[PDB]
Structure 1
């Protein structure tokens, strides 16, 4: 804690007054059977932020790993930054507090550090005891059904959660800039964080610029582009040249004795965009944490900028073929 180089301890000061680590551990598709051990060892290795969600179905296991490290005194609770996300089924204001209480109960925590609206999409509510996580289930087989709940109504409910301190900060995910522009017109509390798909194939620079100009922090997901989606046989990801072998990336990695993956992560964090790389592998765990001790050059950013092709892998358009979800159209 005394070497004057960049490290995994660097943080962003949120507009709520709390610090958020720039580098955290992503929990999507972290396997249930081993998730607690993975989270515990990530804490041992030095991870302090964990990016969870109601949708991910491993909330209890994440909590077991956290509470093991807390019980052993490896870390204090206030050193950890726990993020969760309100799923689409729970946008009705009357269900927002219920959803947070469910997260806290599952994770066996008194509070979470950041609660995000996971998507600007409002599914018909499904009771916890009918299906949890409900995922795409809307009470009627495979058919999607939706609730007429404007985003601002959900947001006002999220605002009330900060007052009791059970969610220290609140934010949004997968909102376009146009939606954020309208939301702030009705917001008493600005979102602290926007979390979005972000990688060199999908750079959305004007979204980044507008949102950061508002003092809203940005967290990138799927920083390795198509990689996260190969195991799901995402046809577009299967057909996309890997960022790990792309000549623009590898030639930059060659300059700094870093891996392509480390360049892809630092490309975000050096621009004050937080990252949450995911791995079930305890060997890339450390490489993904130690990305802030080198700097890309201005020419490197210029070169990486050329890769933008508006290639989006996580697009709800593909979920419901009867009622297309147009949040990124």
Structure 2
């Protein structure tokens, strides 16, 4: 019995899934398949990762070999910024289903509250930060609610069982719900002990919207730690608060960081090409953090965000987190 979240859409989402963000294309199909074998059922994808095709190979391989049924899996993808124009939303979902070789996805998210200039799929895919003009960014004047209304229409046809958002601030969600007929089922955000955004969490969960975390391990390189305003922030794998808790339960820092989220009903999507870690991540809910552990971890919040589109376009700063 793996844990799941009952979405407001009526469908169940596994609490612990496999994040395909940053997974290399060469090994992706095997990694996905080997994950399904281990027991993973949710797989987090996106139009911008560029491995949707390889993810599908792993899925359909498991389906063909009879390791699982389709309704047992939970497939997430994300509408990239280039396709916020309502005319291109349905086309984007078709593109996802085509690449992954699936008849439907379980969750389709607006990847960012950002609308790049539409780049035809034939011109470039994944478009990433290309907007039809070299390295220059260009944007479309498409309010988020217009894109959401197109997302709501997708659910009428079944091609997307549930719809959601990613990287939306609480203020944006607050306004979006004023015009939404269907509330988002899921909000995905950067979430780790250094970026805890407790009031965002409280408000979003108060609305019955599930939350998925990415970057659960926090910053792990120079530029990622450079966002800190403190003098010498360590990685959460070395922070004394994490290692002490980890040592106390004979768990790894990674398991503590993942359980810190899942135990608060925040879905996690870790990745791993290591068999021992792959099973450790899946069974991360085998121990319990105490009230005292949570109080100590809450002290680490320092508003350290290292996935910030502000750093994308230097000519027109993207202020979604400003």
- Check conservation: 1:82, 1:113, Cα contact below 8 A: yes
Query: What is the CA–CA distance in structure 1 between the aligned matches of 2:189 and 2:11, rounded to whole Å?
Result: 20
Aligned residue for 1:113, secondary structure, equals strand
What's the counterpart of residue 57 of structure 2?
64
Query: What is the CA–CA distance in structure 1 between the aligned matches of 2:31 and 2:114, rounded to whole Å?
Result: 31
Matched, 1:144 2:137: yes
Query: What is the CA–CA distance in structure 2 between the aligned matches of 1:281 and 1:239, rounded to whole Å?
Result: 30
- Check conservation: 2:227, 2:305, Cα contact below 8 A: no
What's the counterpart of residue 201 of structure 1?
194
Query: What is the CA–CA distance in structure 1 between the aligned matches of 2:26 and 2:230, rounded to whole Å?
Result: 27
TM-aligned CA distance change 1:144 to 1:81, over 3 Å? same
- Higher mean C-alpha deviation, range 249-258 or range 62-71: 249-258
- Check conservation: 1:31, 1:280, Cα contact below 8 A: no
Number of aligned residue pairs: 322
TM-aligned CA distance change 1:229 to 1:18, over 3 Å? farther
TM-aligned CA distance change 1:26 to 1:229, over 3 Å? farther
Shift of 1:146: 0.1
Query: What is the CA–CA distance in structure 1 between the aligned matches of 2:98 and 2:49, rounded to whole Å?
Result: 15
- Check conservation: 1:54, 1:86, Cα contact below 8 A: yes
Query: What is the CA–CA distance in structure 2 between the aligned matches of 1:226 and 1:71, rounded to whole Å?
Result: 38
- Check conservation: 1:12, 1:19, Cα contact below 8 A: yes
1:160-208 Cα deviation digits (max 9, x unpaired): 0000011000000000000000000000000000000000000000000
Shift of 1:279: 2.1
Shift of 1:293: 1.2
Shift of 1:240: 4.4
TM-score, normalised by the number of residues in structure 1: 0.94
TM-aligned CA distance change 1:132 to 1:231, over 3 Å? farther
1:43-102 Cα deviation digits (max 9, x unpaired): 001110000000000000000000000000000000000000000000000000000000
Aligned residue for 1:83, secondary structure, equals strand
- Check conservation: 1:229, 1:237, Cα contact below 8 A: no
Query: What is the CA–CA distance in structure 1 between the aligned matches of 2:214 and 2:230, rounded to whole Å?
Result: 15
- Check conservation: 2:108, 2:163, Cα contact below 8 A: yes
Aligned residue for 1:116, secondary structure, equals strand
TM-aligned CA distance change 1:202 to 1:103, over 3 Å? same
Query: What is the CA–CA distance in structure 1 between the aligned matches of 2:192 and 2:79, rounded to whole Å?
Result: 24
TM-aligned CA distance change 1:177 to 1:125, over 3 Å? same
1:128-150 Cα deviation digits (max 9, x unpaired): 11110000000000000000000
Shift of 1:228: 7.9
Shift of 1:281: 3.1
1:197-250 Cα deviation digits (max 9, x unpaired): 000000000000000000000000000001388799999999741101111001
Aligned residue for 1:85, secondary structure, equals strand
Shift of 1:254: 1.3
TM-score, normalised by the number of residues in structure 2: 0.96
Query: What is the CA–CA distance in structure 2 between the aligned matches of 1:29 and 1:9, rounded to whole Å?
Result: 25
- Check conservation: 1:112, 1:167, Cα contact below 8 A: yes
Alpha-carbon RMSD: 2.0
Matched, 1:34 2:27: yes
